Amino acid sequence: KAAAPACPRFDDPVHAAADPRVDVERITPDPVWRTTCGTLYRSDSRGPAVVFEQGFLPKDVIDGQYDIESYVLVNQPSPYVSTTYDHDLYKTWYKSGYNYYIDAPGGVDVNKTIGDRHKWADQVEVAFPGGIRTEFVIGVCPVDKKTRTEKMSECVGNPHYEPWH
Numbered sequence: 268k269a270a271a272p273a274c275p276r277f278d279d280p281v282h283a284a285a286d287p288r289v290d291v292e293r294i295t296p297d298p299v300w301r302t303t304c305g306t307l308y309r310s311d312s313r314g315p316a317v318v319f320e321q322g323f324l325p326k327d328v329i330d331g332q333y334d335i336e337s338y339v340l341v342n343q344p345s346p347y348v349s350t351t352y353d354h355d356l357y358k359t360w361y362k363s364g365y366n367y368y369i370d371a372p373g374g375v376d377v378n379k380t381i382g383d384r385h386k387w388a389d390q391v392e393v394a395f396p397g398g399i400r401t402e403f404v405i406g407v408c409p410v411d412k413k414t415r416t417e418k419m420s421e422c423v424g425n426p427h428y429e430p431w432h
């Protein structure tokens with residue numbers, strides 16, 4: 268056996284951002300940043316040819332909803348890309364055809380920032396302001412809609428993934 272090491276910590280809290288125009292000072296409430304570095308996940312209907320080329324871009328870093336509680340409760344264009352600590356959350360997202368695997372520094376830990384009592388606390392969300400560059404996307408597994416399971420012989424690694432720890 269061996270114990271795992273601790274995580275590298277970047278000076279820039281949005282080092283991972285695909286759109287660096289995000290304005291960290293506009294995040295509300297005061298963000299509690301994720302300091303661990305385990306694999307995160309994102310269910311997305313968008314296909315890997317697009318995600319591996321572009322990363323995950325946020326819908327609106329200029330005029331989107333910077334309030335985290337508002338964004339979580341009421342789907343609204345935002346500067347954030349949502350991810351989760353829960354490998355299996357894809358099973359709750361109907362028609363989301365893929366489960367993406369993410370190895371990225373930082374992100375706002377939603378439940379640490381807004382509490383763990385809100386309606387969607389069981390999503391155990393990490394919100395990436397400015398999104399996530401492709402170098403931090405490990406790969407993807409497509410999801411069989413009828414059984415809500417991953418089609419593991421059809422997983423694909425991202426050629427642009429750059430391990431960093």
Ligand SMILES: O=C(O)CCCN1CCc2[nH]c(=O)c3cc(F)ccc3c2C1
Nearest residue numbers: 308309310311349350351390391392393
């Ligand atoms: O995502 C958009 O662009 C807007 C539509 C809404 N989505 C799509 C997909 C998706 N995937 C996730 O894994 C996830 C994980 C979370 F913890 C919280 C939210 C999500 C969402 C929310």
